[PDB]
From Swiss-Prot:
Residues reported to bind Ca(2+) 1: N180, D252, Q253, E257
One function term, GO molecular function aspect: metal ion binding
GO cellular component, one term: membrane
Name of encoding gene: tse3
Binding-site residues, Ca(2+) 2: E374, S377, R378, D381, N383
Enzyme class, spelled out: hydrolase
EC number: 3.2.1.17
Organism: Pseudomonas aeruginosa (strain ATCC 15692 / DSM 22644 / CIP 104116 / JCM 14847 / LMG 12228 / 1C / PRS 101 / PAO1)
UniProt keyword Membrane, yes or no: yes
Keywords noted in UniProt: Calcium, Host membrane, Hydrolase, Membrane, Metal-binding, Secreted
Entry protein name: Peptidoglycan muramidase Tse3
Length: 405
């Protein structure tokens, strides 16, 4: 193909030219991504013995990641040929892609994640690129975590050593610095205009996902909204309900909290923190296999705890995890006997347990309120979160209003 022709030239050596430079590698990657016949291109490269050379010669891990994610993402019928060539290419024991943010994924696992993600994105309808909807520039206070800013938790600088020492000694002032920013939830909402609220919601859903696998997508990363819609369809939810849960968490989130969430989880301590958009707890993601619909069993079986924590920092994995767990909680609700949940019935008298089995568009508002309690706290133990239900319900009202807009 025209693309394989160019790639063969770019990776070749000459009288001069004893290396595939970073710029040549970038051109190769762009050619792969711009290609209208990617399977044909891979077939041609393999036939000429150039496929293994391609993987071996694109050296810096950051470029290897882009190359491998792009090829895994674009291939269908030649998927196996690419994977096999990648495997053969690693015989001289390169770092491959296993560095930096991706140090918890072996190189072949990186390929397999990208293949599964691209396939999921295609099948579930979130492959298509979103606009560069604007992120918040905030660096502290409520609504300054990744939901607002698009700054990935895995990209945040190491917490200052002085603070790590204070956090270790459980210093009140420093703990607060890295914890939930909101005390009185209702007081927080009371200080926002309707327009402020719609703005937050739009900021959250309108911007591209902060993803650890951007080149697995055919173009630019999809909007949060698109991924939330895909998850809503997969789990019989709505983007308004998923968005309400996430907007509540993100209002009660800061940049510093994000840094602590991630860094503690992958430290030698392997802390069980809540991570990312939906503040999914690492243990919950493992207990309930929350990536089931984006990653195959072979990939999931091999994931380390720290790999799981890292995936939770990738917005699309987090949105699917959040949504799958919401549907788990709703399904569990539908199996309950309301007579055995007198505190729940007391607090939410219009709760309809059977309705939980269906779509949120047909849920009473009390179902949204009760589920908010039972998302943040243990589900259906008849112990309720004090203020989370009205906090999420207000965000829900906003999404119904935004949906209105
Ligand atoms: Ca938080
Ligand atoms: Ca797979
Ligand atoms: Ca509970
Ligand atoms: Ca909307």
């Amino acid at each position: 193909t025209a693309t394989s022709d160019l790639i063969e030239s770019l990776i070749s050596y000459s009288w001069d030219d004893w290396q595939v430079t970073r710029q040549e590698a970038r051109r190769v990657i762009a050619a792969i991504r711009n290609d209208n016949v990617p399977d044909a291109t891979i077939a041609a490269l393999d036939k000429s013995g150039s496929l293994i050379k391609l993987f071996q010669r694109v050296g810096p891990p950051e470029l290897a990641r882009s190359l491998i994610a792009s090829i895994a993402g674009r291939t269908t019928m030649q998927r196996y040929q690419a994977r096999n060539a990648l495997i053969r290419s690693l015989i001289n024991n390169p770092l491959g892609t296993q560095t930096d943010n991706w140090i918890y994924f072996p190189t072949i696992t990186f390929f397999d994640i990208c293949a599964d993600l691209a396939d999921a994105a295609g099948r579930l309808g979130f492959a298509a690129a979103g606009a560069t909807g604007v992120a918040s520039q905030a660096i502290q206070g409520p609504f300054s975590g990744v939901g607002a800013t698009g700054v990935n938790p895995t990209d945040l600088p190491s917490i200052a050593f002085g603070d790590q020492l204070k956090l270790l000694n459980k210093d009140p002032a420093t703990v607060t610095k890295y914890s939930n920013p909101l005390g009185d939830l209702g007081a927080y909402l009371s200080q926002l205009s309707p327009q402020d609220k719609l703005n937050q919601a739009q900021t959250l859903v309108g911007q591209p996902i902060s993803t650890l696998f951007p080149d697995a997508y055919p173009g630019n990363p999809p909007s949060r909204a698109k991924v939330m819609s895909a998850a809503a369809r997969k789990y019989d939810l709505t983007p308004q309900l998923i968005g309400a849960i996430i907007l509540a968490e993100q209002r009660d989130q800061t940049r510093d909290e994000d840094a602590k969430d991630y860094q503690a989880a992958v430290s030698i301590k392997s802390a069980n923190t809540s991570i990312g958009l939906g503040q999914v707890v690492v243990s919950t993601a493992i207990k309930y296999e929350l990536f089931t619909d984006l990653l195959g069993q072979p990939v999931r079986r091999g994931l380390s705890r720290k790999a799981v924590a890292t995936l939770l920092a990738s917005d699309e994995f987090n949105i699917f995890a959040t949504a799958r767990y919401i549907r788990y909680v709703a399904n569990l609700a539908s199996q309950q006997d309301l007579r055995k949940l007198p505190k729940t019935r007391g607090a939410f008298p219009s709760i309809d347990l059977r309705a939980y089995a269906g779509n949120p568009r047909n849920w009473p508002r009390d179902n949204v309120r009760a589920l908010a309690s039972e998302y943040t706290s243990r589900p259906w133990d008849d112990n309720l979160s004090p203020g989370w239900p009205m906090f999420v319900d207000d965000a829900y009202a906003t999404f119904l209003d935004l949906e209105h807009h």
